[PDB]
Design a protein around this ligand. Sequence first.
Ligand SMILES: N#Cc1ccccc1CN1CCCN(C(=O)c2cncc(Cl)c2)CC1
Ligand SMILES: N#Cc1ccccc1CN1CCCN(C(=O)c2cncc(Cl)c2)CC1
Ligand SMILES: [Cl-]
Ligand code: NA
Lengths: 302, 306
Amino acid sequence: SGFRKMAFPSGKVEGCMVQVTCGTTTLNGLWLDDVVYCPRHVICTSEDMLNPNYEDLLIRKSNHNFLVQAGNVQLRVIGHSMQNCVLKLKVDTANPKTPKYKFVRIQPGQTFSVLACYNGSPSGVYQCAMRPNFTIKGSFLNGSCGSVGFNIDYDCVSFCYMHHMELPTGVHAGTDLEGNFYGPFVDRQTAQAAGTDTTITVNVLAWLYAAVINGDRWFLNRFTTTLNDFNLVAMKYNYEPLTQDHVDILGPLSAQTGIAVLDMCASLKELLQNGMNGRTILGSALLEDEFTPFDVVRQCSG
Amino acid sequence: SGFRKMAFPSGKVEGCMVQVTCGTTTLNGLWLDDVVYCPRHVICTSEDMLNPNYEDLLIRKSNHNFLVQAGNVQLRVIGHSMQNCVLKLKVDTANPKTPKYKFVRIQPGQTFSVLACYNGSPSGVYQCAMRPNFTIKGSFLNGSCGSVGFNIDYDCVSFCYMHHMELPTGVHAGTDLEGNFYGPFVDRQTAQAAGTDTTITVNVLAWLYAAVINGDRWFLNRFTTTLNDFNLVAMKYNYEPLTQDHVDILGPLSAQTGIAVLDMCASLKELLQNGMNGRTILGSALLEDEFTPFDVVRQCSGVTFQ
Ligand SMILES: N#Cc1ccccc1CN1CCCN(C(=O)c2cncc(Cl)c2)CC1
Ligand SMILES: N#Cc1ccccc1CN1CCCN(C(=O)c2cncc(Cl)c2)CC1
Ligand SMILES: [Cl-]
Ligand code: NA
């Protein structure tokens, strides 16, 4: 029993973290085979950040301008190129600790583990969700750029996030490993803001199923609802719409607990309309939306 | 900025996890140098569990009755001994991935990372605190015994917990790496229950200081309190007493934010009386007690957002 925000074991990713230095800037890189991946903003000075022309800044750099340190060993940079907002530094040694991996782009609502790093050294691991507004509520300080997000699908690491910046509200923005930003953000010091966020409905339902599996049932009721009436309520409370795809994905949890998805939707409707009335669910006074249906099944059954 | 429940990177511990089998029972073991540590209850049947005589059960076992599997490799057991509630299996290979490590016994209120494992293979990592009633609120299923708790302040792993059992209320109990249980618990299937738990006051204060460092001051007030009046009020909400040791430990956070410890105590007294009135603190609608003063300093910026 028990239910905790759980990250994947980070060992396979720790063996890939390196320190990348360009001029006075030091940040983190991901070393896979003979390539080190890092944010392209490593080549910028503070003044360049206002309106950088990355192609022009890069042409002025030689391979020896990039210092890559893996533990206490210097790696030799033998090539460099850009792919979208990530710099790819070709090195002379393949990482002997390279795990089986893929680069995947995740959808809003999906969760992943973040390995926070400073000077190429891992400092902590925590679980995040890609918000509907394409930000992540992480915990990052100066020097954390290049820290990565991932999931592990068996023995294969799926890298899905690389950290680039913090927005004025204290939330975080980054790219996939192909350098495409999540959300309408850019790698330049211009005015940017997180858009209004919404709650991930399918994940709140998954967490209510986790609460039932763990013995917390007070919120269950005799009522059911239709998908259309439930979505009229969800919109009023700034919850994402629930689709038939979401209902299908919750199928297994519904079968195990004997609570149909629309039966759980009626409990959620009541919680949104009346609050918790001084009670908690899995030790929380708010409805948690950062556990996917898969996360619940993986932790509660495996 | 941001504030999350953050665990230590688990790689140094993943390289130590093995599977231990004795008869039909399989659980996890920790392989450090040439010794595999695991719960001694691996030698019990379900019937043995009511009143096991571990010395009598162990004397009937030979080294070859213990099967230890590290990845896809079988390790050879060449010795065995019991130390309190842990079994120590001497093996013929030293773990080449053994990190720099130590065994530390922790006090209530201290936090640590748990690497949940099943069949010697890591499943997930999360942060836990040793509750005042000597239990932990973890996430463990059948097969998780032998999973360990640790901290990694620097490059040295400090192992502080080994998982043995789940109590009737769904909370968890275990030992230090010398086999001494935390709390009054025993490794037998008798009626035992967790004592009434309380909130870890020093950690809630640490977390209020984290909220101030990150730019939030809404909960502060113009008042102060004496330590004794604070404790009289706190104990009415089932909060642990705050001692002069706790006040001293909060000194650095107090100096960084400019808020005296007893002034933060007055804010906590008011939050206990009023609740949050629809507001949140670091994204929570409840007062958080599983971040120590040391955890706050590790994670937070050294510059407060004034
Ligand atoms: N791309 C981009 C971008 C876009 C707008 C502005 C600034 C940047 C880059 N910028 C500069 C490098 C240093 N930096 C951190 O190291 C950092 C990371 N996360 C959290 C914190 Cl508090 C600090 C901030 C990010
Ligand atoms: N020591 C002790 C003790 C003392 C009282 C009763 C039972 C035990 C041992 N017992 C038997 C082995 C299997 N088991 C789990 O694998 C387990 C762990 N954590 C959580 C869950 Cl749900 C299950 C339960 C623990
Ligand atoms: Cl301690
Ligand atoms: Na219902």
